[PDB]
Write a protein that binds this ligand. Structure first.
Ligand SMILES: CC(C)(C)C(=O)[C@H](Oc1ccc(Cl)cc1)n1ccnc1
Ligand SMILES: CC(C)(C)C(=O)[C@H](Oc1ccc(Cl)cc1)n1ccnc1
Lengths: 306, 306
């Protein structure tokens, strides 16, 4: 019993972290097979970041300008290229610790673990979600760029995020491993602001199921609702509209607990309209939205990984 | 910027997890050098757990009754002994992945990371604290016993917890790596209940400093207090008494922010008496107490680990 914000074990990703230095800038890279992936802004000065022309800046860089270090051992760079907002640095040695892996582009609402690193060295691991506004709420200091987010299924690491930017409001933006930003963000220091931080309704419902499984049931009520009635309340509270697809995804948790999805929606509706009245659910005083249905099933059943 | 509940990278501990089976019971063990540590209740049936005589049950077990498996490879058990509530299974092969390590017995209020495992395989990592009542609030299912808690300083893993028991109220009890339970708990299925779950005041204050560092400052007020006046309020709210030692430990965070410790105490006092008024601090609607002062400094400065 018990339900915690849980990250994937980080060891398979730790073995892939390197330090990348270009001129005066040091950040992290991800070493998989014979390629190191890192943010293209490694080539910028702080001055450059206001209005960088990456293609032009890159002309002045050769393979030997990209210093790649794995622990205390230097890697030899034999080629480099820009793909969208990442650089791919070809090295002469395949990472002997390369796990089975895939590159995935996730949808808003999906969760993942972040291995925060500095100077190629892991500092901590924590769980995030891709927000509906395409930011993430991370913990990233200067030097953390190039840290990655990932999910694991058994023995395969699916990398879904590389960290690039902090907005002036303290939230975070980044790319998939093909170098395409999530949402509308760019690797320039400009006036870009995040849109509404909508609550991920299907995840809140999953977490309410987790609460019931783990003994917290005070919020269950005598009511039901419909998708359309619930969504009229979801809209008022800046919740994502709940779809039939979301209902179907909650099916297994509905079956395990015997609580119909629309009944749980009615419990959530009452929580939104009435608040918590100073009570808690799974040690939280707000409605948690960074557990997916699959996260809840995984943690409540004990799924492990090679 | 940003502040997250962050666990240590788990790779060094992943390399130490094995599966231990004795008769019909399977749980996790920790393999360091040529010794595997695991809970002594591996030798019990579910029936035995009501009133086990461990010394007597152990008589019926030989080295070959302890099946130890590291991934898909079996380890040879050449000796075994009971030390308090753990078994030490001597194996004929030193773990080649043994990190630098220490065994530490932590104080209530100190935090640590847990690598939850099943069948010797890591499932997730999360952050915990030793509560003032000597429980921890974890996420542990059947088969998770033998999962460990730990801290890392650079390249050395300090193991501080091994999981043994779930109380009927859903909180968790366990031992240090010498096999001594934290608090008054025992490895028997009996009526043992946890005492008051007191809030770790020094950790709440550390987290309020983290909030200020990261931009959340609405709760700063015009007031100050004294230790004795604050503690009269701490007592009413089931907070641990704040000592001069705690004040001294907060010194660095006080210096970084320029907010005197007793001023932050006065802010906390107002939060306790008035509540949050529906506001949040670092994405929380309650006062978080599972970050230590050292955790806050570490995460706010970017300390990494070999
Ligand atoms: C943007 C998205 C995810 C909808 C997309 O178009 C996706 O392409 C990828 C992009 C980045 C990676 Cl890392 C992986 C796939 N896709 C291709 C074919 N069907 C879907
Ligand atoms: C119980 C405690 C922590 C106060 C204690 O007595 C401690 O002993 C240990 C016990 C378990 C481990 Cl894992 C490590 C040390 N100690 C010895 C000498 N001074 C302090």
């Amino acid at each position: 019993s018990g339900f915690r914000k849980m990250a994937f074990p980080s060891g398979k990703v730790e073995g892939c972290m390197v330090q990348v230095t270009c001129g005066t800038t040091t950040l992290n890279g991800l070493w998989l097979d014979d390629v190191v992936y890192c943010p293209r802004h490694v080539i910028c000065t702080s001055e450059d970041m206001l209005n960088p022309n990456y293609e032009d800046l890159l002309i002045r860089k050769s393979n030997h300008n990209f210093l790649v270090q794995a622990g205390l051992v230097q890697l030899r760079v034999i080629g480099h290229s820009m793909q969208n907002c990442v650089l791919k640095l070809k090295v002469d040695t395949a990472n002997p610790k390369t796990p089975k892996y895939k590159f995935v582009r996730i949808q808003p609402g999906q969760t993942f673990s972040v291995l925060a690193c500095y100077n190629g060295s892991p500092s901590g691991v924590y769980q995030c979600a891709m927000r509906p506004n395409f930011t993430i709420k991370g913990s990233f200091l200067n030097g953390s760029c190039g840290s990655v987010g990932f999910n694991i299924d058994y023995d395969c690491v699916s990398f879904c995020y590389m960290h690039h930017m902090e907005l002036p409001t303290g939230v975070h933006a980044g790319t998939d491993l093909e170098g395409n930003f999530y949402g509308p963000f760019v690797d320039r220091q400009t006036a870009q602001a995040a849109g509404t931080d909508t609550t991920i309704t299907v995840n809140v419902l999953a977490w309410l199921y987790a609460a019931v499984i783990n003994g917290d049931r005070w919020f269950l009520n005598r009511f039901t609702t419909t998708l359309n009635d619930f969504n009229l309340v979801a809209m008022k509270y800046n919740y994502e509209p709940l779809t039939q697809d979301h209902v179907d995804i909650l099916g297994p948790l509905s079956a395990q607990t015997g609580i119909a999805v629309l009944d749980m929606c009615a419990s959530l509706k009452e929580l939104l309209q009435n608040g918590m009245n100073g009570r808690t659910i799974l040690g939280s005083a707000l409605l948690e939205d960074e557990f997916t249905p699959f996260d809840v099933v995984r943690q409540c059943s004990g799924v492990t990984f090679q």
